[PDB]
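Predict the holo structure. Ligand: calcium ion.
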Amino acid sequence: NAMADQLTEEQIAEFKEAFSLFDKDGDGTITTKELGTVMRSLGQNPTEAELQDMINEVDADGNGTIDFPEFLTMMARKMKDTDSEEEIREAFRVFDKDGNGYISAAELRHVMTNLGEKLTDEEVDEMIREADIDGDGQVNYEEFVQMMTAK
Amino acid sequence: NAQKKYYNAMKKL
Ligand SMILES: [Ca+2]
Ligand SMILES: [Ca+2]
Ligand SMILES: [Ca+2]
Ligand SMILES: [Ca+2]
């Protein structure tokens, strides 16, 4: 509950509404049957074991249904991912000093130094080279996102 | 690695 304990009362209320779209009988639990109904409304045709698998990913207590606390943990994890994505785009905008969509070595040097980083010139060059998948000498947004993706 | 350096800089931002 450490993740869910980080949510505001307002976020909890939004998420209670989201939970209700799954928990259509209002009994406090999302079942595989309920999930299947939602997935079919999304144009999917899952199997029972697929639904069970989806439940299992969220079902911290192993009881086979999703309660509100488990739902809140899931939503808190999604919020954290959204926040991380936002931090990465905002950092890209700064590192790409001229806004042209590519981080050059010179730009990276400037930003690093202005942030008080003491990286040597070789280290800056290395950072560009490692991230530069396409070989054009600079780092585009998708290259940056890949570089910042956990392992 | 390069990722850690980029990350350390992002935390300064
Ligand atoms: Ca229910
Ligand atoms: Ca459960
Ligand atoms: Ca640029
Ligand atoms: Ca590139």
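The pocket of calcium ion (ligand 3) is lined by residues A 96-98, 100, 102-104, 107 (CB under 6 Å). Chain B has one helix and no strands.
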